[PDB]
Structure 1
Amino acid sequence: QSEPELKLESVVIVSRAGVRAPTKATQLMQDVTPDAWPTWPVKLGWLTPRGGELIAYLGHYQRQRLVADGLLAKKGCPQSGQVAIIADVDERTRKTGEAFAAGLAPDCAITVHTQTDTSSPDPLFNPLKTGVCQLDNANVTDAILSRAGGSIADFTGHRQTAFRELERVLNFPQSNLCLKREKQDESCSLTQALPSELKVSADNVSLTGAVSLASMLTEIFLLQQAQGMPEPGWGRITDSHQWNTLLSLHNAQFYLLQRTPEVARSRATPLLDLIKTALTPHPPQKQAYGVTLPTSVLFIAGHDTNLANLGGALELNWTLPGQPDNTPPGGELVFERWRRLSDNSQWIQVSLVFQTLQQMRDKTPLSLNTPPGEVKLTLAGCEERNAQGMCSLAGFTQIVNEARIPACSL
């Protein structure tokens, strides 16, 4: 029987945290809808038990997958250090790492390593926020406006259909923001009522107004749906086209602020360094987070901006059939090193593993038989590929080295 010509030797997963309750409950969020936002079972920004179950399913799926590729043994707990887990200091990322280990190796006790100071942000997940490095204000401003077509107005203008869909779901017309508006000479509009301005500083970039509000609100509706709440969007979201139209507002903001290279490259540099060393064969040694690398599997519990920053820095673009959110909760950017048996050459494969919005909704258990969705990625900048379309280690290493910003390494 035909034999595999490539042997899996290393896997690095960068996962976004799973389903959580919204991070905030502002007055603005209430003013754009006359209806009352549904309450969540956990504190704001915390992982919901259902969210952990969905992550555990992915962990259960990955265990079957890696076993099939012979990287992990089908029985028992993995050898010490065989599986390493690192998470951002947040409650939701720590819990995502735990839910993943739980699903991957039940009752096996796999440490979830984090930065030691938990009351402080971890620069691995954003070197801009902690001041490791700074953004070039003028250059970032030009790059974002450039990707916006010259102006934020023209940008939102091309997405009015999506903004009106959101208004419809909110019953924006009967919101206090609308009824208490002084220029009632014109129809009430989110984009009109909340002008979006681009804010850029050394440590951050943002969009004020309807752009950021809509990105947050549409993500909240996806969260309600994934959380299994009765009627997400107060029952006003009734079909797939609406889900896509709504979430496009979310993907639109990430395209501008997280994928733009002038931002992404600096923001994803620490992760690029970690991913590269973890995938590069070399003498194992205890290091960051007390983790020993290289090893067989490395699971990194991060955030959606991390996935988007990595996509922009590596020029990895994707769309996920069945999942309106390009960087969905639990979504995994999977990096794998395969060794070609023929000449023992090294190769890197990249894919985006995710659960469809329905798989989240029905909380469906995953397995090789009922697997999550997966999109194989192509490194836009790679030249040397193998028969399977993977990039050589050398090629991959070159792309990472050209994409990272030295000033932003840890």
Structure 2
Amino acid sequence: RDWQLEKVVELSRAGIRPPTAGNREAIEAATGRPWTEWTTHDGELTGHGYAAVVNKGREEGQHYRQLGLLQAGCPTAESIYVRASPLQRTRATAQALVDGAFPGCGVAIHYANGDADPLFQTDKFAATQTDPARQLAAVKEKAGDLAQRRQALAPTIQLLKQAVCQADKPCPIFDTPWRVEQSKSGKTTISGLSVMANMVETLRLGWSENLPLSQLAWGKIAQASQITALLPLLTENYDLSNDVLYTAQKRGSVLLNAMLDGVKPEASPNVRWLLLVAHDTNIAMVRTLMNFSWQLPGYSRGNIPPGSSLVLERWRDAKSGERYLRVYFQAQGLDDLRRLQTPDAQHPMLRQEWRQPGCRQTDVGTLCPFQAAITALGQRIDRPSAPAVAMVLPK
């Protein structure tokens, strides 16, 4: 064996949900019409979603057993520790991963007893909140000329409009111009853009979910490429919220820091696989601190599909004993999610590896000298926004 996988740290998005209750309100207002009620309640993990997460978890358990990271059969407390955001959908996604990865093993997942996990719901904690003024300036300054941003996305706006606007009923959202707005709690959003992004997320999920076409966008969206063509609105909005450096630094530092620490040797707890299941906003903030940009086929830049994941693997060269870090983002494509495709040679997980000078290509992926990879990924972290967190939750 040339290379030995030693530790996985992974940050999963929740699987397929219907729109959240907030989304639904905003998108039915914005289009003057009701949108499909799913078989799952708003905000929760759909069965289809769980099926898809189980599929990924099944391959991942097999993959990490084959690589010798995990022992055969049922895991122990040394094999994996799973910590999920306390929302229903992330708990259920966490169950779904271990359901796939450890068939029949009744593996428990952990989550915080409140409504807030200091890794995830970071706006609920003093050290990890944004300052309203700073946030506004940072968003305003990344946004720049918003009318010009809107003009560049006009074709994409139009595709969205033809998909979601009833013919001749008015559709106010496509009409409002784009401004930075800031609610009394300090959340910033981009008028028109955000809700459009919410719409696009919802269409992507409905696609992924395998909704009937008539309940996805009233028959208008019939092939994956039409979801793909809407996704630059969602990237635009990510660029102007979660992936705004300052926001990622106040809200995401604690998570990246807990991930880099978890991938370090002597980590606590001592487990071979540290699995964190949380939200797209979390992944986006983390990957922005990592300055890791990806674009997977069928998706637009930075896109975070349901049940996708950011992974840090620490590997050891069998010969020299030297340590390396591999970093990648993985997801399934639109149709694979729709079809509950089990990932395999003819239908592989989509994946992009992070790289920087010094990384080496190997049989097991792009491997980067460890210390210099940890230093580079960690550079953008705001230390005062990264309190240490005890990774093992209580019961």
TM-score normalized with structure 1 length: 0.86
Structure 1 match to 2:180: 198
- Report SS of the residue matched to 2:158: helix
1:165 to 146, 159, 168: 159
Contact 2:193 2:237 in 1 (8 A): yes
2:92 to 79, 95, 108: 95
Change in Cα spacing, 1:89 to 1:27, as seen in structure 2 (3 Å) is: closer
- Letter of the 1:302 counterpart: A
Contact 1:64 1:367 in 2 (8 A): no
The structural deviation recorded for 1:298 is: 1.2
Aligned: 1:256 with 2:251: no
Q: Within 5 Å, give how 1:6-405 maps onto structure 2.
A: 6-24=3-21, 26=24, 28-33=26-31, 36-73=34-71, 75-117=72-114, 120-148=115-143, 150-177=144-171, 190-192=173-175, 194-199=176-181, 204-231=186-213, 232-282=216-266, 285=268, 293-324=269-300, 326-367=303-344, 370-378=347-355, 382-388=356-362, 389-405=366-382
The structural deviation recorded for 1:409 is: 2.0
Structure 2 match to 1:182: none
- Letter of the 1:405 counterpart: D
The structural deviation recorded for 1:18 is: 0.2
- Letter of the 1:250 counterpart: L
The structural deviation recorded for 1:107 is: 1.6
The structural deviation recorded for 1:19 is: 0.3
- Report SS of the residue matched to 2:113: coil
Whose radius of gyration is greater, 1 or 2? 1
Question: Distance between the aligned counterparts of 1:207 and 1:33, measured in 2?
Answer: 18
Change in Cα spacing, 1:158 to 1:28, as seen in structure 2 (3 Å) is: same
- Letter of the 1:333 counterpart: L
Structure 1 match to 2:390: none
Question: Distance between the aligned counterparts of 1:335 and 1:383, measured in 2?
Answer: 17
Contact 2:225 2:298 in 1 (8 A): no
The structural deviation recorded for 1:350 is: 0.7
- Report SS of the residue matched to 2:240: helix
Question: Distance between the aligned counterparts of 2:95 and 2:193, measured in 1?
Answer: 34
Contact 2:292 2:354 in 1 (8 A): yes
Change in Cα spacing, 1:401 to 1:130, as seen in structure 2 (3 Å) is: same
- Letter of the 2:191 counterpart: G
Question: Distance between the aligned counterparts of 1:354 and 1:54, measured in 2?
Answer: 11
- 1:362-405 CA deviation, whole Å, 9 max, x = no partner? 11123466432222222xxx544345442222113323442221
- 1:185-221 CA deviation, whole Å, 9 max, x = no partner? xxxxx343x3332235897542243111110111111
Contact 2:291 2:377 in 1 (8 A): no
The structural deviation recorded for 1:248 is: 1.3
Change in Cα spacing, 1:113 to 1:204, as seen in structure 2 (3 Å) is: farther
Structure 1: gaps spanning 5 or more residues: 179-189, 286-292
Change in Cα spacing, 1:202 to 1:337, as seen in structure 2 (3 Å) is: farther
- Report SS of the residue matched to 1:43: coil
The structural deviation recorded for 1:135 is: 2.7
Over the aligned positions, Cα root-mean-square deviation in angstroms equals 2.3
- Report SS of the residue matched to 1:106: coil
Structure 1 match to 2:386: 409
Question: Distance between the aligned counterparts of 1:154 and 1:307, measured in 2?
Answer: 28
Contact 2:132 2:186 in 1 (8 A): no
**Number of matched pairs:** 380
